[PDB]
Every structure is written in C-alpha cells, then in structure tokens.
Design a protein around this nucleic acid. Structure first.
Length: 910
RNA sequence: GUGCCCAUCGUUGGCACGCGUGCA
C-alpha cells in the first residue's frame, strides 16, 4: 500500500576548483576520521548494558534475554582493535560473572559459534565499558543510568533509531550513521542467525554421529559439502533392495564354484553393482541431480557396516553438520562511510535542477544549457571553522536523459551521441516536463583523491491489488526462457474455468531482448552465438590447438585408448549448424576434462585459455550471448581456470594468494572473468525484468494490473522443498531475476510481484490439473519419422516398463506411453523390439493413413507439451485418441503452469 | 554513469539498469 524505494544514478565528480575541492575533501576526511570515534563510543555504550535493564517492552520474536544480552556485549571484532582482552575459552564463566546469568543453549550456541580467527576475535565490551567509564571519570551508576535511558528510547542495543532522533536526544548525524550502522545491522543478523541455528541444531539427530563420521570417511577414502541430493534420498532404499537381490544371486555363486573362475564372478559382481548404481543415478538424474557414482560405489563397498535406514540418516546428518559448520557469525567490523546528503534533515545540500540552471546560464555566456550538473553542498571548512555552501560538478549523462533536463519545447563516441540525441530533443519538442520537486538524497563518499556522488531519490508506488490479469515466466536454463499472461474473468474464445472463474489465456511466448544490428535483429537472452558461417578461423585455431594432444581417459567403463592426436568431441561440435556459444561451452568442458586428466602438463595450457578469453578475436569475454547456456560458458570457464590452478601445482590447500604468486596473469584473468559474469548476470536480471515489466505495462494499458508469479526461497519459514530442488532453482541466481523484477515493480505503477514455490510446476496440464482432478499429463516431442534416433525409441519403450514407480513422473510417462500405443496401436510385442527402422516405417504408414504428417511421441528431453486449450497461439488441434488436444509448446505451457499455481489464493474472491 | 549485444564495431550502431548489510 505504501512502499517507497530508492533510485540512484551513480554520478561522477569532476575536479573544477582545486581550492574548493580540497576544502570539501578536508571536510570529508574530518568526518571520516571522526566516524571511528563514534563507532568505538557506541560500542562502549552498547557493551555496558546489563540484565534487568531490558525489563521494558521485551518485544522480540524469539530472542531470549541471554542471547540479546550476550550478543550486545559480546561481539567478534577485528584482531587489531582496542577492545581486545577476551578469549573464546572462558566465555561461559565470563558471562556468569555478569549479573549471575546461566549460559543456556540459546546463548551457548551463540558462544559455541565459530568465527574467522585469522582476521577477527571476540571482544569483551564490558571491561571496555569500565575503561570508557574511567576515561570519562563518571560513576558506574551514572553511566548505567545513562545507557538505560538511551535504551529506553531505543538508542542502544537492537534496532536503533535514526541519527536524527539520536543526535536530537543525544555533521554528527552523518558520521554517526556510518558508525552504528554495523552495530545495528550485524547485531540483528547475528540474533536471527542464532535463532535459525538453534532451530536447525537441536533438530539434528545427535544419535547417528557415529554413522555420520563413518560416512564422512568417504572424503578420507579439495573438499566439498555433502547433501541429500548426493544419494537420491527416497530412492537409495530401492537401490539397495535391488543390490540385495543381486547379492542373493551372488551368494550362490560365491559359496559354490570356488575354483579359479570366481575371479570373473567378483569382477562381474563389481561391474553389475557399479552399472546398477549408475543407471539408478541416471534415471533419477532426469528429474534431479545425478548422485555421484563414486560416492555410491564407495558407500556400497561399506554396505555391511551401515544399515538400510542408517545411510539416509548419516547423509542428512552430514549435510546439517557441514552447513552449520560453514555458516559463521557476523563480526561487527568498521563500516566504511558514505555520508548521504538530503534536503529534509541531513546535512543540507541540494542539486539546483533545470529551471535554476537555465537562470544561471542566462546570467552568464552559456548558450542554452550545459551538459553537466551543479550541486550546492554545505561544506564545513575547518581552517575557517564555518559552514559554506559550495557548488560542485557532476557529469551523469543518464541523469540528464532522465530528470535533469528542462522542457524548453514539448572514446567519447557513445557518450557524445547520448547528449546530441538529447540535444535533438531541444529542437524536436517532444520531451515532457519532469516536475523536479527536489526530493533527492544526494550521497557523497570519499575513497581516495576522488568522489562517487550518486544523486539518490525516493519513488513511491501505491501498489494496486485488483489484478485483472496475471503473468508468469519460467526463468530456467533448460532452454528458451519464456512468459505467459492469463486473464481472470474474460468472455471470448477462452472461457476456461479453473475452480470458479474463467481464466482466459491472453498471450504466451519466449521472452527475448531486441538488439538491432546493421543487418540482423539478435536476441541476447537466446542468441546462442553465431552459426559459425564466418567464424571458421576461430574453430580452426581451436582444432589446431587440440590436434597436438593425444587423448584422455573416461569413467564410463574404466578404460580408454588412443594412438596419436585422437579427437574427443570435434566431430559433434565443429558443425556449422551448431551455435558458436554452445561450441565454446562444449570446448571449455572438454578443456576442463583434459586438465582433469592432463594435470602435470598444465604449464602448456595457459595460451589457449588466454585465446578463448582475451587474445582470441572471437573470445569468450568479447563475444557471448546473454543466453542460459552463455552463463554455462562462464561457469565452465571459472571451473576450468580453478581446476587449472588446482592441477598446475600438484599438499596443504592452495588459496587465492597461492594462485596470485604462481601465475599473476591467470589470476587477474579469473578475477576479470568473474567481474564480467557478475555484471553480466546483473545485465540479464535487469533486461529480463525490463521486458517483463514492459509487457506488464502492455497488459495494464490493455486490461489492467498484472501479477508476475515469481519464486521465493526464504522469508516464508515453509521451506517444504529440499535443498536439492532449492539448489536446482537458485542456480545463476534465478531468484535474482525475480528479485530485480520486484524491485522494478516498486516503481512501475500498476504491477505487483508475488512469489510461489517451484513445486507442482513440472508437467501439470494447465487449467485442468487441480481444476476438476489431478491430471499431470506428460510431455512429448513432435517430430517427423525422418529424424528419429535410438534415444527416442529407447525412452518411449522404457516408459512402457511396469514396475514400482517411486517417482510419479515414471508412472505418468507409463500412462502416456499406453495412450500413445492406443493412438498408434503399436503392438507392444513388436513395438518393444529392435530395428528402430521398423518403428519409423510403421509411423510413416500411420501418418500416410492419417491426414497428419509429423508424428508425436512422449519423451523427457523434448518440447511440444500437449494442452487441452489454445495456449501457444500457434498450437494445432491434434487428436490423441478422441481428445482433440492442442500441440502447444512445452516451454509456453510451463510458463502457463508456473503461473496461476496459487491464483486460487493470490487472487481470492475478496 | 556503470554495463550488456555484434564474423564487421558503427547508420546519428541497438539496448538496459539502484548504488552499499547475509543469501547457495
């Protein structure tokens, strides 16, 4: 209803007058050097609190007295700091000495919380409070009364007030907000951290610690965290059932036939178990992350030592323990200041704005208006100890285009264009008035010999509720991220009722950014690179590089062979049909594998990485597509360089500084590429948000307010999803997209963001699933018989296998395969046979009989999901048996179902 | 003002965006 948000334009300061610039710099340095004084002083006041002083409202959600008090006078400050004097050993008795308090679990687990002893350490804040009292020559009773009074006005402890009220009751304000900002933020973060840990520490079994260490022996059999997704929590039971069945088939072969042939028996037993676990991970890997075969075979090798239901407990115990032991506490560190400036209660100072800029340009020999901004900032000069309002220059061209241009009429190539383009507006008479208002909270920070002013501003929303329309999007890396907008109560072709209202499918399509080019119109979100029509030299250089390397060893069958200059994937990656970005991704994966094997000779693997990233004309850094597999290219590049460092020095662990010292250029390259990927993921977030909000505006001007149906992880205390799908979702910070989209929702009037978990959003048939009854129809892959392969027939016939389908997806694909047989009359006896050419011929005959020409068969890695209505807007009415379904696009139907998931609640009939 | 896209880097190339606490 009332949610204001900030917006800054990251302006740039210019040195215009050395004397005044240095005066402002001296004032800023004065305030910056005075800020640590207030930081230490407020630490001193905070540490002085004692029990019986919080005996007021006591309005905390679940924070006990012990935790609040300990955290408020126990903190982890940098090692090189005055408050030193305590060690992490005697913490319990130290707390006991203060007010005779018993350290309970609530406070103990805070105490029993690890920190980074390399740079931080615990500080007393109580003997330091006594030191402050002594240095102030004030009685302990007086200081205690003063701090109690301050806490009464919420001026110390948890959730302090703003510097305005503080200083009013207690130039000082701005340096104060750069001092107690950490004292206010880190305290709350730590208290919530301890709450979460206690809520996730007691829940740990505490009885399987023996089995936990037993399984942890796997690592001692770089270190990474173990999680339940490494086993397939609910399916390893069936895996061991099958392995037990095999063992019974091996007990007879072991007790009997003990001659010189049981060596082959044990070899085939090992092969059978390894291949069974591999098939187990692959089949479950089609819906989740494939468990590491190495871990599974290791644990099976210790099957006897662990019971059937003890492996699950051990792995979950390890997950909980190793996420608890890597989640650290928040150290209250010296905050760097920023010194915001505002026109309401901060240090008085103002951007002048356009009408006044025109006034001051007319009084001088300025043509009509200058390309820079002038800000009047109140600098308190020290030499002349007084405040003067001095004018300084900002150069934010974007700001000029946005709000800093008047309505007269209604290396520098790029930048100059923006002003000239904006200059043309002065003579085209198009730009509307901006209604300055002068409500900008300009921020001025001093790092070195420069400044980074921003000109922040506050924008209100007044969010609406009557969402006449809804919108959803996929935000996945499968392929073709997409969106779909659905109306609520329309009356037309689509009057499809869900429970009590006709949700009409308005539109649905892939969301791709438009980036016009001299001769084409590419899409950053899905370009996938060029089709290698002109990029022959780049791939040819890659071929020349990889021609001189013999081969590598795989792990599918524990053996591989080569003679000389054997290839790995060129025959299936050097095709002009393949996209450039995918080619680079595959090449980077191949190099990652090569270094994984060829580790000793890493000295020769630096020029190539440079070429793919810096030196190559079509380098990864230069040319890339802001495509879902594009982030895959950068992730594989990061992993490639990390593994290159880890396999060049092949043993204490090697840190970032070791990488610096070993090779300076490579480490700088990894940092540059990480920055590239960080700002590029920011770019994808903002661009997808911009398109979604623009299409939301389209709907708003068409019909009305539109929701977006995003995905949330925290702030709901549900977390019904496991860490498995949580990680499978949060990749490439998908939430960030949603996050960005809600931040922009804070300004684009009429929009509104609501997030819904990713559950029940995989194969649901839109508008019929959970409308009358659960449907959960499967996906397929429309295609002609002329381009089938072994995989398609293998997959469809595998769907026909009748067993205990633990995963509902397998059962639903079984039902889909039965429906496919009914539609085609495949004669399962003959359909489940070999010679896929026979199946293709039968499909061709069926298509010749029917009027249709392209066949339609179920599959997993396939698009063209079947819907019962017109969704894709290009769907054809294909009859399955007698159902006259619509062959829409799988991605669009996924966009449809990920939307409206909880519309029955997000859009109640209130 | 930072950035993103490009066989070629401009046709006056196209386009986007909040800077700073914890998010995998």
């Amino acid at each position: 209803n009332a949610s204001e948000t900030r917006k800054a334009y990251t302006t740039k300061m210019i040195p215009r007058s050395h004397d005044r610039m240095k005066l402002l710099g001296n004032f800023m340095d004065y305030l910056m050097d005075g800020t640590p004084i207030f930081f230490e002083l407020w630490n001193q006041f905070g540490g002085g609190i004692d029990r019986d002083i919080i005996s007021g409202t006591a309005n905390k959600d679940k924070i006990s007295d012990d935790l609040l008090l300990a955290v408020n006078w126990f903190k982890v400050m940098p090692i090189n700091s005055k408050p030193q004097g305590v060690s992490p050993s005697n913490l319990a008795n130290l707390f006991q000495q203060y007010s005779g308090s018993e350290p309970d679990i609530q406070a103990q687990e805070y105490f029993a919380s690890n920190f980074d002893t390399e740079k931080h350490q615990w500080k007393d804040m109580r003997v330091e409070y006594e030191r402050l009292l002594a240095e102030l020559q004030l009685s302990r009773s007086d200081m205690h009364h003063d701090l109690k009074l301050m806490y009464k006005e919420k001026c110390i402890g948890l959730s302090l007030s703003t510097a305005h009220y503080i200083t009013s009751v207690m130039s000082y304000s701005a340096m104060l907000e750069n001092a107690l900002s950490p004292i206010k933020g880190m305290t709350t973060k730590n208290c919530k951290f301890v709450l979460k840990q206690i809520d996730a520490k007691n829940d740990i079994k505490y009885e399987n610690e023996p089995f936990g260490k037993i399984v942890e022996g796997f690592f001692d059999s770089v270190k990474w965290v173990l999680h339940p997704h490494h086993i397939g929590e609910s399916n390893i039971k069936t895996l061991w059932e099958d392995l037990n069945a095999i063992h019974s088939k091996y007990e007879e072969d072991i007790a009997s036939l003990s001659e010189d042939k049981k060596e082959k028996r044990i070899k085939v037993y090992q092969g059978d178990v390894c291949q069974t676990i591999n098939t187990y991970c692959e089949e479950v890997g089609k819906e989740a992350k494939t468990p590491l075969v190495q871990l599974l075979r290791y644990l099976y090798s210790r099957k006897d030592d662990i019971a059937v239901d003890k492996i699950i407990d051990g792995i979950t115990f390890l997950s909980k323990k190793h996420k608890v032991e890597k989640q650290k506490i928040n150290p209250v560190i010296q905050k760097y200041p920023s010194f915001n400036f505002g026109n309401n209660s901060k240090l008085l100072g103002k951007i002048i704005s356009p009408k006044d800029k025109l006034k001051h340009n007319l009084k001088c020999n300025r043509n009509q208006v200058d390309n820079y901004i002038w800000i009047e900032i109140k600098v308190l000069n020290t030499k002349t100890m007084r405040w003067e309002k001095h004018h300084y220059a900002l150069s934010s061209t974007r700001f000029l285009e946005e709000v800093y241009y008047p309505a007269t009429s209604e290396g520098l190539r790029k930048v100059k264009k923006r002003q000239m383009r904006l200059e043309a507006a002065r003579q085209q008479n198009l730009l509307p008035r901006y209604t300055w208002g002068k409500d900008f909270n300009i921020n001025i920070c001093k790092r070195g010999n420069n400044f980074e002013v921003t000109l922040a501003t506050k924008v209100k929303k007044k969010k609406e509720k009557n969402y006449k329309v809804v919108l959803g999007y996929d935000a996945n890396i499968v392929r073709k991220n997409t969106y779909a907008a659905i109306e609520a109560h329309a009356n037309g072709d689509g009057v499809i009722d869900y429970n009590d209202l006709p949700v009409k499918p308005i539109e649905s399509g892939f969301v791709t950014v438009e980036s016009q080019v001299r001769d084409k119109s590419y899409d950053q979100l899905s370009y996938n690179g060029v089709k290698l029509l002109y990029c022959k030299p780049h791939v040819e250089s890659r071929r020349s590089f990889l021609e001189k390397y013999r081969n590598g060893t795989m792990k599918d069958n524990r053996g591989n062979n080569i003679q000389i200059d054997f290839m790995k994937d060129f025959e299936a990656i050097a095709d002009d049909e393949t996209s450039l970005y995918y080619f680079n991704m595959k090449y980077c994966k191949l190099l990652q594998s090569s270094i994984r094997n060829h580790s000793s000779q890493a000295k020769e693997y630096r020029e190539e990485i440079f070429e793919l990233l810096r030196d190559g004309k079509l380098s990864v850094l230069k040319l890339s597509s802001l495509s879902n597999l594009s982030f895959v290219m950068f992730k594989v590049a990061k992993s490639l360089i990390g593994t290159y460092f880890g396999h060049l020095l092949k043993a204490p662990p090697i840190t970032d500084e070791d990488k610096q010292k070993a090779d300076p250029e490579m480490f700088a390259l990894r940092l540059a590429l990480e920055e590239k990927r960080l700002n590029k993921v920011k770019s994808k977030k903002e661009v997808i948000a911009n398109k979604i909000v623009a299409k939301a505006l389209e709907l708003r001007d068409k019909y009305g307010p539109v929701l977006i149906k995003g995905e949330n992880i925290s702030d709901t205390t549900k977390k019904g999803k496991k860490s498995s799908t949580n990680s499978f979702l949060m990749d490439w910070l998908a939430r960030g997209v949603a996050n960005k989209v809600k931040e922009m929702v804070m300004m684009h009037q009429g929009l509104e963001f609501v997030e819904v978990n990713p559950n029940f959003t995989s194969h649901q048939d839109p508008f019929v699933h959970k409308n009358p009854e659960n449907t959960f129809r499967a996906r397929y892959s429309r295609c002609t018989p002329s381009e089938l392969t072994e995989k398609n027939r293998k997959e469809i016939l595998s769907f026909l296998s009748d067993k205990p389908s633990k995963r509902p997806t397998n059962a639903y694909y079984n039902e889909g395969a039965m429906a496919f047989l009914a539609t085609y009359g495949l004669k399962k006896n003959d359909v489940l046979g070999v010679s896929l050419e026979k199946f293709k011929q039968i499909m061709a005959n069926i298509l010749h009989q029917r009027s249709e020409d392209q066949l339609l068969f179920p599959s997993r890695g396939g698009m063209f999901y079947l819907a019962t209505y017109k969704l894709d807007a290009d769907a054809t009415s294909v009859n399955w048996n007698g159902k006259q379904f619509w062959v829409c696009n799988a991605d669009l139907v996924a966009a449809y179902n990920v939307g409206l998931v909880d519309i029955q609640k997000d859009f109640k009939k209130k």
